[PDB]
Amino acid sequence: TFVKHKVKDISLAAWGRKEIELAEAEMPGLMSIRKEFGPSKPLKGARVAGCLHMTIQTAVLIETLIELGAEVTWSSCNIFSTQDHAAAAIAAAGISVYAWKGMNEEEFDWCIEQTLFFGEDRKPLNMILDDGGDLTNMVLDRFPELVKDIRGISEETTTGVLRLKDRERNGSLVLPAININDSVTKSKFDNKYGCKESLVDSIRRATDVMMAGKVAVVAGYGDVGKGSAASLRGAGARVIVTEIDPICALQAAMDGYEVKKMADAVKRADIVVTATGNKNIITGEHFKAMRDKVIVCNIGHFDNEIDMAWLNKTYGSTKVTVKPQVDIYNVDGHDVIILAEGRLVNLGCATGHPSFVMSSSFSNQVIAQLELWENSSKYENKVYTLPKSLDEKVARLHLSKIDVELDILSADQAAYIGVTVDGPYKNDEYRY
Amino acid sequence: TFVKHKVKDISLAAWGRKEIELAEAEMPGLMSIRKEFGPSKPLKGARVAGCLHMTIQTAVLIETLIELGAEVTWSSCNIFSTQDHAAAAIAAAGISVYAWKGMNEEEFDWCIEQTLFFGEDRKPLNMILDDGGDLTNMVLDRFPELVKDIRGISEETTTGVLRLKDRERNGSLVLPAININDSVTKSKFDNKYGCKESLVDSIRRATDVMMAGKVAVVAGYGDVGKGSAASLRGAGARVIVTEIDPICALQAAMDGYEVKKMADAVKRADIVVTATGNKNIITGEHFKAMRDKVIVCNIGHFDNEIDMAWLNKTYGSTKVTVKPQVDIYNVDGHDVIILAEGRLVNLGCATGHPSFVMSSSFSNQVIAQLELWENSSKYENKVYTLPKSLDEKVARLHLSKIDVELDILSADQAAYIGVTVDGPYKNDEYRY
Amino acid sequence: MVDTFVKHKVKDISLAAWGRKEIELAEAEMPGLMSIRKEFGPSKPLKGARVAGCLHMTIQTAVLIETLIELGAEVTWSSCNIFSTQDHAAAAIAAAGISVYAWKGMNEEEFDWCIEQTLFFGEDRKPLNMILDDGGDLTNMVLDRFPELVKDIRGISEETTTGVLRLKDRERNGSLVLPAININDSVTKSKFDNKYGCKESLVDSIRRATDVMMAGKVAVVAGYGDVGKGSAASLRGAGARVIVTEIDPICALQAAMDGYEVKKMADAVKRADIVVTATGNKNIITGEHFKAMRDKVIVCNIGHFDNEIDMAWLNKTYGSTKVTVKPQVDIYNVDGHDVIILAEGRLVNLGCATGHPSFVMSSSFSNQVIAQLELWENSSKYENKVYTLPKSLDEKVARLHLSKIDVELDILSADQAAYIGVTVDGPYKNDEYRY
Amino acid sequence: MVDTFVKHKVKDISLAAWGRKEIELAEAEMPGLMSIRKEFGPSKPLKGARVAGCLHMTIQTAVLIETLIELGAEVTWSSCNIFSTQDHAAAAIAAAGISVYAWKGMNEEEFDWCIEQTLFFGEDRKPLNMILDDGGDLTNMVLDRFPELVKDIRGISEETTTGVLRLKDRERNGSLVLPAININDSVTKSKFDNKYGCKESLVDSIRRATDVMMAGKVAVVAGYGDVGKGSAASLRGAGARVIVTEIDPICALQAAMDGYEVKKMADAVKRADIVVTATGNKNIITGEHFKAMRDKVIVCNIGHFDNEIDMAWLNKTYGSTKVTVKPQVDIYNVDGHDVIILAEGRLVNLGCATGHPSFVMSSSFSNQVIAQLELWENSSKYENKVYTLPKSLDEKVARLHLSKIDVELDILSADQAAYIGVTVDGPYKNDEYRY
Ligand SMILES: NC(=O)c1ccc[n+]([C@@H]2O[C@H](COP(=O)([O-])OP(=O)(O)OC[C@H]3O[C@@H](n4cnc5c(N)ncnc54)[C@H](O)[C@@H]3O)[C@@H](O)[C@H]2O)c1
Ligand SMILES: NC(=O)c1ccc[n+]([C@@H]2O[C@H](COP(=O)([O-])OP(=O)(O)OC[C@H]3O[C@@H](n4cnc5c(N)ncnc54)[C@H](O)[C@@H]3O)[C@@H](O)[C@H]2O)c1
Ligand SMILES: NC(=O)c1ccc[n+]([C@@H]2O[C@H](COP(=O)([O-])OP(=O)(O)OC[C@H]3O[C@@H](n4cnc5c(N)ncnc54)[C@H](O)[C@@H]3O)[C@@H](O)[C@H]2O)c1
Ligand SMILES: NC(=O)c1ccc[n+]([C@@H]2O[C@H](COP(=O)([O-])OP(=O)(O)OC[C@H]3O[C@@H](n4cnc5c(N)ncnc54)[C@H](O)[C@@H]3O)[C@@H](O)[C@H]2O)c1
Ligand SMILES: Nc1ncnc2c1ncn2[C@@H]1O[C@H](CO)[C@@H](O)[C@H]1O
Ligand SMILES: Nc1ncnc2c1ncn2[C@@H]1O[C@H](CO)[C@@H](O)[C@H]1O
Ligand SMILES: Nc1ncnc2c1ncn2[C@@H]1O[C@H](CO)[C@@H](O)[C@H]1O
Ligand SMILES: Nc1ncnc2c1ncn2[C@@H]1O[C@H](CO)[C@@H](O)[C@H]1O
Ligand code: NA
Ligand code: NA
Ligand code: NA
Ligand code: NA
Known about the structure:
The structure is a homotetramer. Chain A has helices at about 15-25, 30-35, 55-65, 85-90, 105-115, 135-140, 160-170, 185-205, 225-235, 245-255, 260-265, 285-290, 310-315, 345-350, 355-375, 390-395, 410-415, and strands spanning about 45-50, 70-75, 95-100, 115-120, 125, 125-130, 155, 175-180, 215-220, 240, 260, 270-275, 295-300, 320-325, 325-330, 335-340, 385. With about 425 residues, chain A is an alpha/beta fold. The first copy, chain A, has two domains: about 1-190 and about 355-405, Rossmann fold (3-Layer(aba) Sandwich), CATH 3.40.50; about 195-350, Rossmann fold, CATH 3.40.50. In chain A, strands 11-10-9-12-13-16-15-14 form an eight-stranded mixed beta sheet. Chain A has a seven-stranded parallel beta sheet with strand order 3-2-1-6-7-8-17, sandwiched between helices. The longest helix of chain A is centred in the middle third of the chain and has 24 residues, at about 185-205. The complex binds nicotinamide-adenine-dinucleotide (4 copies), adenosine (4 copies) and sodium ion (NA) (4 copies). One nicotinamide-adenine-dinucleotide sits at the interface of chains C and B. The PDB classes it as hydrolase.
């Protein structure tokens, strides 16, 4: 059975298309890539299956791949992250998209499965574009017959990369993969500035809480945690950080944040944000220790950061939904407010990162797809990163929109520091 | 004809009631006032007509007045500020409310008129609680027969106060009025921290624009402008301020902001925010000078800050609505994005100020209503402010929720600085 | 029978050339004062005035002094604090022939003597006829100890929150026997000098004294008036985490809204790497606080007097352990944990660095000159009460500082001005406006 | 034929007591170094080592020196900058019997002489066998001018971005004839010292030199690497508005995302009240820039060498107008508008104040000691190439600084550790992690 697309409400397409146009202006990276590579159609013959939050921003990525000549199918990598107007606009353009806000797990899995075959004649995918490794897992674990004709994987996020490196270690990585999470222009921008933009946004939409006067706990101080703390502080919340890594903890301290163990920090929290990529950050002992009407949410990729299974089993009978993705539990006479059932809060309760920063991440994606499509045979079944020259190009593409003007090295200056005038400007160990 | 209430959709009441309960916990001022004054029903016999944004926060004010024994009727003071779930919850409680999001001007005026008479037997109002002076104007200009039995006015905002002071000068102020805008615990908190919380919130909901990398112009650097600049800077925008007052301009400069004339500033703006309480801040010359897809909005009380009449007359034929309260105009080949048709953006495109800060403003309102209801005969037909002891009490009521603990002066310390231990702590000229 | 005439007394008059160079640099950072010199200088409106000043003898104050002289005044001067004088500033003023009695590191007897010398001008001892004060100590000396001189004195101008409080007590008690202009409460003073000035100079002074890393530390600021607001901002801007104490629920709620934890001192002090008193009150830090402190806590005061910290208790109880690291940085061993005291608990910004920068002092001192002009010319139209300057002058002061920092104002049309109820050239706010 | 032995050379050895008091205070702010003293001191693992250091002779460096001695090393020392020495620190070190040759305000001949003395230990002239360098000038002297000494030297440790670049050029050219450990690129150095250190000390140094008001000013920072990031943050935290220049599109996009305007110097410099070079490159500020500047602009450099600003051009063209306000604050009249130069364009934080505070230097210097230990014991296992320290040691350094500032870590369970692919005691990040 061939289902051309599945979306919540296709009448939202006009609205979606208007926002896609506005987003295009905020995404000069992607648009510049369309101009540069569009005329040559370098992805003619490519059949790219994407599993990645079906947002307005993602719509621009999809249409960039199509302008480069690709066939494209798509699903979301999270049950609450799809923007239904974005999905509708993509479906109205004739594209095979299977995504809506508020799927269940069976629906989620079905959507990914549909993306593996293209058109009524069922031509299988030959490229994977993934965010979290769920599409990758479906193909490698459940459709291994399809790996022969697939040229490569590109992976968006810290958690999916970790899964790929485990596959590499275990000997089950049977395709080359490009890790674009660790492009400088992704990790140091998307994870950091993106969460800075969208964390507080999502908590405000969900709860309309006053930030000034509140204390918030952010678990983790990697790039997501750094940005999350900055989101909260910029809005006027006082932030306490938790960490396991002494270097990251010392960074937080130097950035002005108190750093304590969660067992202590959680007692003082009006707001709790998990940002670790790890599991069991917030457990039953934490829930029992919390202040009344604490707001608890997660901005790491999966919903195991918060022990929702414990919360639902133990206090599920008291659960009251205020509105979609804002649930209140009565834990022993004090309320706990859970956002998006502990799934990615920025995407679940608002619209995720803004278009401008996603243009950098998605510019990296297109470059990686181009590279594997053209050159997959020169790659081993291992995880790679993009060369610095391409990482620098991505940054360069975003400067003009925001009136950032660079000085140009003279030949003398360039020689003196051991670089060429057009870069790369830093050696490969440079941390920015 | 007696209409008991008029709201968009009364089935939103359950949702509204849940949020009202959450708001109650964020509003300890109002709740404390309920406990203190509720048992004595000091407003028994009062018939309070309110004209004030019909939000979740306002619902708590309304129900506070009822718990003090008042009859209450209500409308909104802005066509886009009502929260329909709040209005529905109030209507479901049997209260006469006439308010919905997206009224026209005829509807707006009708709603206010209904509030003047209470119940099927049409008992006229005897108290006025106003925000912007539109209810006051309707009674004094169009129902002057009703002034005899009305005991007083309380006024919420800088613009309504200015109208009252003009009436005082002109000799048309025929009731006593308490100006609660200029309670310290209102002006220095609501106008400042409130706009800090809700300005950026509203722009994000409307547009989902990246703030980092953008330049924003804020016109005016009174309390609203101070908070608006802080909202933007905290989110990562670079802010240029405009002013006419050299002191306020020098404040902005000392707070780190470039200060330029609008004619110059507007050319550099990704985002434009009017915060003056004045008219013709953004005119046709400004619109023609703007960058493509500039976002233009107003956070001052009325929609004359931006010359919408000029924009609609001249480029109205190009107008495209993206979604409600986000309109795009093509001004000579470059787009201008207008939020909420130039009306209060925080209330029009998001939910206005959060509950915690509105508890201070509305605590002042209740205190002023109590004071006029009981003691109106001791007042001349002039604008008054509340004594500092009551202003301090309002602040005191909000400290415990956010774990602010005061030291207590010893008798020796109190004598030394010339104050009593329980205050007032500052003389009346103190500016905070 | 025969009086001693000392022309000036300064630490080292050979520092004058250095002082003069910095005065010149300061002049460019003080457009308000310089503009006032040009406007009023040619007409010498202070001819015949003999102004005794008691006010921190800094480079900034040198510009004030020479502004008054350019307006035609005779001027004598002392410092209002024992550690606040900048010796090169004092030397430059002395080298210009002016009677200044001030140096860094006076004792109390020396302090009092210096003020006394300022009351009489030249070897022929013409008495003062104007008072320019900062803290009320000159005012107290004249009214309490030289009341014969009050007849010929026309007025007082007062610089600071603490001196104003003293004047209001005199007003209440019935001992204020001269008109006084309170320039502390010019908007362009209190909302700028006290706030942005302390923001600039608090951290500066702690760094010069101790060279401590700010990032990673916790600091307690007692008080959240204008000085406390600026002090907290100084620390936060440098990377310290700040806990505020207060007695005033409104000021406390401000601090909380500005992002600061607010607790009682008994609790706060246990967590403090750095303690700053900013109240204008007494007994903020007592023996119980000292015994509760962390090792090598840095304790200082930025309020006008050294009562905020109980130095008498600290010296009596643990003075035998005192070790001076360098001038104005003393370490006490309080029961096996060290307490570092800056400037013996006196104004830390002036005592351990150079106080507020020239740009903000130009506003405060522009207000001073305006007040001296007003009392000199019009003292008879004033009662023996404390006054403030009209808003039109407060606005003018601000206007004079805009061009240096490229602030440009929009101008209201007549239509706009009518709409908001103001004239085009101001004043733009009513008298109750709090900014 | 007969060599002169100078035991030490310092400005004023009577400043030792003051220096010692501040060293003690610094020791408490440097738990990393002190912990390293306790752990390794009893076993004297550096017995027989003769460590020549070339590194700013500050109070912080004194703690490093005495740490190496407590580990059993003989130590000689000079400064790597002519203006960076703190004379009381140098005096304390000399008073302890250590051969130090350093004072504030050397000339170039003096600078070179001081380094030369460090190569031989005691009157009997035992040559150095270890190099501890900051900028590569000691390394250059040994390799270029005393190559006979390379045989017995075991290794080099290098402190700073500029010295590392010199070592990598030697590596490429084939003239690196010793193993080198680059400690600049320990995470706990580059991401802390260069960034948070400059944040602490840039503004400090400008304030001490000029006492300028920061609020209301515009500053240009050239470069947005770690030093530039910290410099911009120093200025913004003090209230200055900062414009950044860059050549690297990624670093430029960072600055823009951090809220800074980013423009070409030709444009930026016209708007600047304050100019700071932070590139490690040459010719950032040239004659065309100087002619375009506002009157009394403050110009300084926080990159390692004085090439960033074209001081040769400024001195040749307008040197006849030069006026020294006080040491390391010089004013030039460039075509009728004044240019204020700090520390003759040399490292401003160290030249006009005291450089980075002790707490952050404890991390950098903990890395130094670890590198010296590693080369002393294990130099034979290294090629003549530049190395960095393993992440496990980089993490250990951080761990040692947590307790002083009350940072407490959560601990992974075995289950959590397995889940994220790490061991419970770390390392917690893979080697490509950028923090
Ligand atoms: N919501 C979004 O839009 C968004 C954006 C980017 C990345 N992500 C996801 O966010 C997560 C974090 O990404 P990152 O790039 O910051 O990874 P990272 O490795 O840079 O940061 C993770 C941090 O968590 C810390 N940590 C681990 N276990 C902990 C515990 N038990 N308690 C406290 N701290 C702990 C680690 O020490 C580390 O510093 C990943 O799941 C990633 O896929 C989400
Ligand atoms: N949106 C909200 O929720 C909210 C909250 C509080 C107050 N308000 C309203 O906001 C407005 C401003 O209130 P405020 O308390 O800041 O008043 P204010 O008097 O404290 O500030 C107004 C400022 O605008 C300046 N100004 C006037 N005309 C100008 C021009 N042409 N260009 C530039 N600047 C100009 C004035 O000099 C003044 O500093 C009022 O309409 C008030 O009723 C709205
Ligand atoms: N160092 C300087 O350069 C400088 C500059 C300006 C003013 N001052 C001086 O600083 C002091 C403060 O001035 P200000 O203008 O902020 O006065 P202010 O009245 O604005 O502030 C003092 C604050 O301290 C609070 N307070 C009083 N007793 C307290 C206690 N026991 N614990 C906690 N808080 C307490 C008050 O509630 C008040 O908010 C005055 O002595 C003034 O003369 C010094
Ligand atoms: N003062 C101190 O205490 C201190 C501390 C640490 C490092 N340093 C020194 O500071 C310098 C910078 O160190 P860093 O770690 O930031 O190095 P870095 O490589 O991290 O940063 C240098 C930056 O300057 C930029 N740049 C180069 N030429 C430029 C030009 N012409 N215009 C604008 N930008 C340009 C580069 O793109 C780069 O981003 C080095 O010389 C280093 O030794 C000094
Ligand atoms: N608006 C958005 N559209 C698509 N992906 C997003 C958006 N915001 C954040 N993300 C991505 O979500 C990922 C986590 O699964 C991050 O790696 C981040 O790039
Ligand atoms: N959530 C809200 N509910 C009611 N009034 C609000 C809210 N947010 C802001 N306001 C008010 O809007 C007024 C402007 O009309 C301000 O004086 C402010 O108090
Ligand atoms: N550099 C300075 N020169 C003179 N007075 C100063 C300086 N810095 C701060 N002050 C003043 O110190 C006063 C307290 O005595 C404050 O009112 C403030 O105006
Ligand atoms: N107080 C200080 N003492 C010693 N070295 C310092 C100090 N402050 C900064 N530095 C060092 O100066 C070096 C540049 O030569 C930087 O690598 C930095 O580590
Ligand atoms: Na978005
Ligand atoms: Na709200
Ligand atoms: Na000064
Ligand atoms: Na130092």
